[PDB]
Amino acid sequence: SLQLLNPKAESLRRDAALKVNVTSAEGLQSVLETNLGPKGTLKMLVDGAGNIKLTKDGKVLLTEMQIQSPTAVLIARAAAAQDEITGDGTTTVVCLVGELLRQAHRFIQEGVHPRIITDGFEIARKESMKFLDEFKISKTNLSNDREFLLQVARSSLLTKVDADLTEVLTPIVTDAVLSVYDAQADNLDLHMVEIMQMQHLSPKDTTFIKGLVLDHGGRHPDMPTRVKNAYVLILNVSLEYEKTEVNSGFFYSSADQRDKLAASERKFVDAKLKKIIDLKNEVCGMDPDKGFVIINQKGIDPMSLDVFAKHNILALRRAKRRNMERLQLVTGGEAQNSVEDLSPQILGFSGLVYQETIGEEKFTYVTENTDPKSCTILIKGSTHYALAQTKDAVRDGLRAVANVLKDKNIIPGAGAFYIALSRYLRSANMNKLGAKGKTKTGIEAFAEALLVIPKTLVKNSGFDPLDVLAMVEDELDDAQDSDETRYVGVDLNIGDSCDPTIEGIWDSYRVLRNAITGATGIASNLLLCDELLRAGRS
Amino acid sequence: SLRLPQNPNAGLFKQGYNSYSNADGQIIKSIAAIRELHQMCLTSMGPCGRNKIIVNHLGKIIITNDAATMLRELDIVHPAVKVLVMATEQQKIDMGDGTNLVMILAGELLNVSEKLISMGLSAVEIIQGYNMARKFTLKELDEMVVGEITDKNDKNELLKMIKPVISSKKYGSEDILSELVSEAVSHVLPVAQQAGEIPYFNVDSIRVVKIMGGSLSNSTVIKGMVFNREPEGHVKSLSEDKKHKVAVFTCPLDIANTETKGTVLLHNAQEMLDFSKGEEKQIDAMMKEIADMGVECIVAGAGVGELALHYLNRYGILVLKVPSKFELRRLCRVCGATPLPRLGAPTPEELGLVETVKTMEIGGDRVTVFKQEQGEISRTSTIILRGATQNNLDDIERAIDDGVAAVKGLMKPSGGKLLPGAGATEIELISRITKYGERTPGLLQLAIKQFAVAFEVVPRTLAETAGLDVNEVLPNLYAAHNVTDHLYKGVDIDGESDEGVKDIREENIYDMLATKKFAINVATEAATTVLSIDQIIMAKK
Amino acid sequence: SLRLPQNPNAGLFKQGYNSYSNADGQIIKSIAAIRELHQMCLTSMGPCGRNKIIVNHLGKIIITNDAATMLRELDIVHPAVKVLVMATEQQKIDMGDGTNLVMILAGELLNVSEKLISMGLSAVEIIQGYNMARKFTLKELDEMVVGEITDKNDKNELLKMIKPVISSKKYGSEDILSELVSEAVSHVLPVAQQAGEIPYFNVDSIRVVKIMGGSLSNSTVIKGMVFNREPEGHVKSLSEDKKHKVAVFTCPLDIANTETKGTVLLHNAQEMLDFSKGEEKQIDAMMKEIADMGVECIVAGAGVGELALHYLNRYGILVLKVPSKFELRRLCRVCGATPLPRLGAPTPEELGLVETVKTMEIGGDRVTVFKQEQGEISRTSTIILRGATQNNLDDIERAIDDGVAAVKGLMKPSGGKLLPGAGATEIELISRITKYGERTPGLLQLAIKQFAVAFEVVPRTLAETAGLDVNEVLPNLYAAHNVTEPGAVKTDHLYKGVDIDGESDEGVKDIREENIYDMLATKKFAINVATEAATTVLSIDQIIMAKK
Numbered sequence A: 001s002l003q004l005l006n007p008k009a010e011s012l013r014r015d016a017a018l019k020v021n022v023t024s025a026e027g028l029q030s031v032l033e034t035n036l037g038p039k040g041t042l043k044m045l046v047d048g049a050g051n052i053k054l055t056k057d058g059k060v061l062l063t064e065m066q067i068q069s070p071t072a073v074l075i076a077r078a079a080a081a082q083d084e085i086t087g088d089g090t091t092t093v094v095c096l097v098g099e100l101l102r103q104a105h106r107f108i109q110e111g112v113h114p115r116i117i118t119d120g121f122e123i124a125r126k127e128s129m130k131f132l133d134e135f136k137i138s139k140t141n142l143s144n145d146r147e148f149l150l151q152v153a154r155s156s157l158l159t160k161v162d163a164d165l166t167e168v169l170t171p172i173v174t175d176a177v178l179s180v181y182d183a184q185a186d187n188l189d190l191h192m193v194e195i196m197q198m199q200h201l202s203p204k205d206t207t208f209i210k211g212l213v214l215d216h217g218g219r220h221p222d223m224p225t226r227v228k229n230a231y232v233l234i235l236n237v238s239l240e241y242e243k244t245e246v247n248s249g250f251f252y253s254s255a256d257q258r259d260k261l262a263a264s265e266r267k268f269v270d271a272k273l274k275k276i277i278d279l280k281n282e283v284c285g286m287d288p289d290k291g292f293v294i295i296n297q298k299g300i301d302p303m304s305l306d307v308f309a310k311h312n313i314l315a316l317r318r319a320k321r322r323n324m325e326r327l328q329l330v331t332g333g334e335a336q337n338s339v340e341d342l343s344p345q346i347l348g349f350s351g352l353v354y355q356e357t358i359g360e361e362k363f364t365y366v367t368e369n370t371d372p373k374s375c376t377i378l379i380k381g382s383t384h385y386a387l388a389q390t391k392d393a394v395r396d397g398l399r400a401v402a403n404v405l406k407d408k409n410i411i412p413g414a415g416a417f418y419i420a421l422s423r424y425l426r427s428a429n430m431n432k433l434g435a436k437g438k439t440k441t442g443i444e445a446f447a448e449a450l451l452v453i454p455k456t457l458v459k460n461s462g463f464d465p466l467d468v469l470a471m472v473e474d475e476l477d478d479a480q481d482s483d484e485t486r487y488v489g490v491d492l493n494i495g496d497s498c499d500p501t502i503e504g505i506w507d508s509y510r511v512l513r514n515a516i517t518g519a520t521g522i523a524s525n526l527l528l529c530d531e532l533l534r535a536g537r538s
Numbered sequence B: 001s002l003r004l005p006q007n008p009n010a011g012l013f014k015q016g017y018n019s020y021s022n023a024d025g026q027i028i029k030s031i032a033a034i035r036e037l038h039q040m041c042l043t044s045m046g047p048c049g050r051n052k053i054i055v056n057h058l059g060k061i062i063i064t065n066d067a068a069t070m071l072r073e074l075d076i077v078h079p080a081v082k083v084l085v086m087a088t089e090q091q092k093i094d095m096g097d098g099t100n101l102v103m104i105l106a107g108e109l110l111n112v113s114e115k116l117i118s119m120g121l122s123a124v125e126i127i128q129g130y131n132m133a134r135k136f137t138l139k140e141l142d143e144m145v146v147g148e149i150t151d152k153n154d155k156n157e158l159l160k161m162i163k164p165v166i167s168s169k170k171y172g173s174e175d176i177l178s179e180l181v182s183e184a185v186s187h188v189l190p191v192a193q194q195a196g197e198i199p200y201f202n203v204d205s206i207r208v209v210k211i212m213g214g215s216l217s218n219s220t221v222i223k224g225m226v227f228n229r230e231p232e233g234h235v236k237s238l239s240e241d242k243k244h245k246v247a248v249f250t251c252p253l254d255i256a257n258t259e260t261k262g263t264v265l266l267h268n269a270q271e272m273l274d275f276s277k278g279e280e281k282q283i284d285a286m287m288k289e290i291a292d293m294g295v296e297c298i299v300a301g302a303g304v305g306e307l308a309l310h311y312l313n314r315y316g317i318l319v320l321k322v323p324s325k326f327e328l329r330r331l332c333r334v335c336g337a338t339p340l341p342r343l344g345a346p347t348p349e350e351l352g353l354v355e356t357v358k359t360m361e362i363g364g365d366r367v368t369v370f371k372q373e374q375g376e377i378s379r380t381s382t383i384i385l386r387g388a389t390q391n392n393l394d395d396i397e398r399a400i401d402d403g404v405a406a407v408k409g410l411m412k413p414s415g416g417k418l419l420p421g422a423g424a425t426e427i428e429l430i431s432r433i434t435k436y437g438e439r440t441p442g443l444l445q446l447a448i449k450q451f452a453v454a455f456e457v458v459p460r461t462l463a464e465t466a467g468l469d470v471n472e473v474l475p476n477l478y479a480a481h482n483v484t485d486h487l488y489k490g491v492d493i494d495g496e497s498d499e500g501v502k503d504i505r506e507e508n509i510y511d512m513l514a515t516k517k518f519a520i521n522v523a524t525e526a527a528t529t530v531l532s533i534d535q536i537i538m539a540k541k
Numbered sequence C: 001s002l003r004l005p006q007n008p009n010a011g012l013f014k015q016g017y018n019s020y021s022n023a024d025g026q027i028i029k030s031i032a033a034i035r036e037l038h039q040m041c042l043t044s045m046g047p048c049g050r051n052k053i054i055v056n057h058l059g060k061i062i063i064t065n066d067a068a069t070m071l072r073e074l075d076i077v078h079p080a081v082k083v084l085v086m087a088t089e090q091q092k093i094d095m096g097d098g099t100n101l102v103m104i105l106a107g108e109l110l111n112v113s114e115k116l117i118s119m120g121l122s123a124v125e126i127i128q129g130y131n132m133a134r135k136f137t138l139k140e141l142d143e144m145v146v147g148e149i150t151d152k153n154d155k156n157e158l159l160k161m162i163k164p165v166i167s168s169k170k171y172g173s174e175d176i177l178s179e180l181v182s183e184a185v186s187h188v189l190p191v192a193q194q195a196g197e198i199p200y201f202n203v204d205s206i207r208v209v210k211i212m213g214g215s216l217s218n219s220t221v222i223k224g225m226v227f228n229r230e231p232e233g234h235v236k237s238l239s240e241d242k243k244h245k246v247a248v249f250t251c252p253l254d255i256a257n258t259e260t261k262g263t264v265l266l267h268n269a270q271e272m273l274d275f276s277k278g279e280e281k282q283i284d285a286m287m288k289e290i291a292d293m294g295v296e297c298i299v300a301g302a303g304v305g306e307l308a309l310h311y312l313n314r315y316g317i318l319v320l321k322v323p324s325k326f327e328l329r330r331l332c333r334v335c336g337a338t339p340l341p342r343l344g345a346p347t348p349e350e351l352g353l354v355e356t357v358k359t360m361e362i363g364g365d366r367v368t369v370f371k372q373e374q375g376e377i378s379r380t381s382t383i384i385l386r387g388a389t390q391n392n393l394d395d396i397e398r399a400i401d402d403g404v405a406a407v408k409g410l411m412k413p414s415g416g417k418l419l420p421g422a423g424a425t426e427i428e429l430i431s432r433i434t435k436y437g438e439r440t441p442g443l444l445q446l447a448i449k450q451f452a453v454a455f456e457v458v459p460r461t462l463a464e465t466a467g468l469d470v471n472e473v474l475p476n477l478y479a480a481h482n483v484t485e486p487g488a489v490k491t492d493h494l495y496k497g498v499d500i501d502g503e504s505d506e507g508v509k510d511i512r513e514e515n516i517y518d519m520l521a522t523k524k525f526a527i528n529v530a531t532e533a534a535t536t537v538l539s540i541d542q543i544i545m546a547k548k
């Protein structure tokens, strides 16, 4: 009856739209299921311009590839929102949504209405949140031990690159936080670390730096590249005027005023430079090994470069907006706009300042600080995709170690949490039902759908997932009667079980909590949608 | 049964996206695709290598045997080739030497993996096979170095470094091209008894100015720079002025005006009579102080007005435009002066010294000669090339750029040392990797044995491009290492190659140690990426 | 998001195949598709019904109000409409009567079914509601029958049967069209009363000849068949009377030819001289035996050679050409003759009797008159139909065939079994089924009560096409049926019916004086076909079409 409204309108009703939600989610999952786990496949994204991007994360894959199917758009927007807050769980949510639909689609063909199926999802999900509190283990972060942070940070890097580059990047992402902490305020920000993209050495030769690194080099040759003692002066004002707000001009009567009107513009430039030179010599005069460095966010007049060249002052222009807040935390200084108010108290301090020339550009390095409140990570690569592949591995590793400090509770990984929910959701007894036979149908579909995560890990390793999970259920049966609590994981090497706590594999709290809740809502709305309609004016 | 189901995934993604995944293709298929471009580089390898003509869509023809230059101008749709193309780009940017070795070695590592995958060896264990074999390769390169040299100063010491690099490119010239680079390096290096702390060296100290016509043997080395411009106002004084102070001004010579647009405002006619002589005496005051300091040459990057050129012509002061800013700092290093944006008056400490300046035509076009004899130059020089064709001189400039790149790679680290060439090092690495596989049992032995097989392409390419049989000379080369004199065995290119043994120390053909270490790390990582990509995703157009 | 999945796995069938199911309102669209052609036949119902013009692809125009004839030339698309189209064609073939009733009744059963489906009644329960109500409907028709035709032929009784049937088809004048058809029926009846023989009748016996020009009042009835023919040799009025002896030959008149390689063989000039005079003596010897028997007319079934027509003009024997078959077959039924293939002397017992053969100008061309007289009666009489337009001549021919088909209804059953006309038949069934719906417990009473509502279309259509308000006239008619039956017998209220124009306000008193009645044998099959036509549409849950 839709064509009577518009001739060009099309629709698919009841099972016609139901087969779409099951097929489109299964087709999208089949592509992204091969990326789950450390043995997962590596995708190469090639656009029309010729750019190559190697990443195993679903956030970049779904962003570069436009999805024509409307059903998979909900999964893409759900996996995108999962990467925003938790920085992880893109592939996990995609594998859960497609599995919740296929497991529930089998009951629909048996005559089960989708309404009671959505009931079994919400009742079983609330029981999983209660089990999540008992299954998680609280940790003490007051000791700031390295061994605990190395294993948690390595688990995220094993899903990106091989073990050779992982062991190099594991202490880097562990050092990515370090001196950035607060006991009382609880505020933790990962935007203070800087991601530098440059081709130097090899991707495995990268190292961590304890101080800020900038991409701007020395503009004048006489500016010393290496400075032992430098006072960073933050200047947000532009020394070179781009334009005057009120339109004005210079009208000279005689040619003698031409050089005078040109010197009139020389007074405003020298007025800002007069207080800067007096600030350097204010501390101590004729003092070797003590330099003075200025980092400016706006442009610097090339004419004024010779003014600082005689005093051996390093100047940097066109700094990033996020760089100003980082100068206060690293160098310990204070952000200043104009030069009207200066003092040695607002000046920063750095123990080592040097610059290196890589290619046709020069980079500024700052390190050796007393109590730096921020740091950086230098990402080097041998090619174009090496910078994008390592960056996606670090950014996904940053959010992993942050949730450890945000939430002291740590949940073991390696599919140990998904298998534990299987036996718990089989029989709910009289606790939560709400109906006779109506709710138990949706709970059974949600319980068996949580086993896709451990089975997908085994399929990427080339083993039999049914034989691996068979020995898992045999160990959990004897562990209940032996009065011993054991966490059984999945080992992809020998095709046997393991202990995530001993093997060093853990998962974040916010990643698993938002994945179960996020995948439940997407799969529920697709089961509750019986018609797919398209209408509009071209 | 007439039409196919079209698959359900056809509606997923778009029709422009193409997929190549495991068991879906690739898997030694795509490896067979790069063999077309791999054979292109095999014919260009060695002193007998063949140059390749490439015509870009713009119409410019670049004839060179360098793999990094050829793959840059070629538009390649196949994505996995760009992994090898970008691998050769790193070799040219950083080290600048070994671009042909990276493309050939990385291409053979994918060819020897054809047998490994055919035997059922997964790509996961293949990556671990090359990584452990690459670490053992870099550790064995230090014990094979007999060419350790602490000098890096005398000209004869560069015959074992710069000359072997020039032997490959433009093999028709050996002592002619080597003398041009060796003399240019001797000029840019400062004269001192002992220079430590790794004195700074850059590729901008040696330059190449190509002039059409003339034989290559007629070329010479000039300590200054040669630019093509038009002098104005007078003929040079030759040596009558001897050393003359040269002032380099960044801003043009003219009465200083504000950045905003001004105009003349005349209220009465009394200022009109003084307006003509006002601009004359205003700029003359700044030009008079320059002649009092003895400055015979003024260089202003921007355009100089006629009012400023009028005064400088009678005092005999040279004016040179130098429009480009990059070449402006190069003339400053010849005289050793400081670029001054202000006009003011020249200060004695900021002025340089140039012995003589002359204007002559090397190829029929007038150029200005900055050559300075007996003077002090710092990190500046040039090489004037003479050739009949423009395309032949293009690769010669790249051969000089590759010759000075070896000096940069030699000077910056502790040292580049030396390695035996002409297939001597590649054969010695075969016996090291082969014996390394038998020391540690396991499944990685298949990847270690095939890793040494890929080293056989370099020594046979010299024999293949020489018109020799690789089933005779090459097998007889392994028997020569049976056992110092067994490390100096190498490949011979000559009509006398029938014996297949020529001493390397006779011609002194050596390769840098730091170049081979950087070439293997890039070639191994490039071949590792192709085997580590399970699925390929394409796009429309 | 930009483009739909466009029904995945639709490649199982060709792109031209479409699937339509009872769900998604397609069963409602199918009922709505009936109303497009239903209103076309509503304005054509009754004596005031309006004829329709339908132009085919060849340009032929057929103007008729008959639902069975109109649906023939129309190109039907919707599949369930063809169920209604082919249902009206069967009613015209079988009983030759009540064609517009099947079209309207089957369409109203689907209209009342739209409310039944909306209330949730399954297709199975709706079918069972109409089947149980139809069995009760057929039983009440036999209880409400009044009067009978009794004797086969009567001058007055044939005005109570053919006249009300032809009143709806080209109404015009009443007694003019009724006398023309009633006269031709009395001639084809064998009569022979008190003999106990089984009566017999043929619907193809009466033939209607369309002749343009003149007026309807100038039409007459001819006992013999009328053809357009030109006599070859001469025209003869045959005023010498004493009737005639006529013979019919289905084979042509000519020298018998060998079916294989007929060829003239002449060996010598002696056989050539006698070959020309030999063929002349053959026809002379064969035609002499026919002339000696007193045969003044010969009917030929094919082309006759010129040599045979020569000797026929010598003895003054007429020549008739009867092409094809059926035209010659009905000629012998008039004169009572038996055709024989040979050219020899016919048997005197097989010769026919025709008193006069006349040729006169009627519509501008020469027609031959086979008309019979009082004695030596003939069968398969023809009716000369005069009219100004040929379009009126086509439907009146079908209007006469409707009266001829009504005569067939007087043979197979025990009698005529007249029913009250003017829509009084379907109105009385409304009150009877309403009482029947209450006597049946359960949920099946919904389809039974609505089955009687579909009978309200007959009084509403006759009132709407008559220019009267259906809101004022229809409820006033139930006042006669709302008083049920009194404490005394002899109730004449069953004769109330719908009136056309005039004074309105019900009217026409009791229809017994109007003499318009209906046939019981027609209403039996009219309800059965119309019910199965609507049942078939409601019994189809899914409809599949090809190429469109």
Ligand SMILES: Nc1ncnc2c1ncn2[C@@H]1O[C@H](COP(=O)(O)OP(=O)(O)O)[C@@H](O)[C@H]1O
Residues within 6 Å of the ligand: A035, A036, A037, A038, A056, A057, A058, A088, A089, A090, A091, A092, A155, A156, A158, A159, A413, A414, A415, A416, A457, A490, A491, A492, A505, A507
């Ligand atoms: N080495 C491993 N062994 C077993 N399971 C692992 C291993 N590494 C990761 N996993 C499991 O894979 C899941 C997803 O991890 P990861 O790939 O980092 O996130 P995503 O799938 O969102 O990219 C985690 O829940 C974890 O339990």
Ligand SMILES: Nc1ncnc2c1ncn2[C@@H]1O[C@H](COP(=O)(O)OP(=O)(O)O)[C@@H](O)[C@H]1O
Residues within 6 Å of the ligand: B045, B046, B047, B097, B098, B099, B100, B101, B164, B165, B167, B168, B169, B421, B422, B423, B462, B491, B492, B493, B509, B510, B511, B515
């Ligand atoms: N005259 C010669 N005789 C024998 N071998 C030579 C001669 N000239 C060059 N070769 C060999 O040819 C090889 C060419 O290698 P080349 O492509 O220059 O290496 P790279 O790519 O590092 O520059 C050198 O290793 C050198 O040993």
Ligand SMILES: Nc1ncnc2c1ncn2[C@@H]1O[C@H](COP(=O)(O)OP(=O)(O)O)[C@@H](O)[C@H]1O
Residues within 6 Å of the ligand: C045, C046, C047, C096, C097, C098, C099, C100, C101, C164, C165, C167, C168, C169, C402, C420, C421, C422, C423, C497, C498, C499, C500, C516, C517, C518
């Ligand atoms: N003059 C009249 N007054 C009242 N009713 C009439 C009159 N003429 C015809 N009718 C009724 O109209 C009905 C029309 O029947 P119709 O459907 O036309 O039969 P058919 O389709 O066989 O011609 C008849 O049943 C008859 O009872």
Ligand SMILES: [Mg+2]
Residues within 6 Å of the ligand: A088, A089, A156, A159, A396
């Ligand atoms: Mg992850």
Ligand SMILES: [Mg+2]
Residues within 6 Å of the ligand: B097, B098, B165, B166, B168, B169, B402
């Ligand atoms: Mg070389």
Ligand SMILES: [Mg+2]
Residues within 6 Å of the ligand: C097, C098, C164, C165, C166, C168, C169, C402
């Ligand atoms: Mg009728």
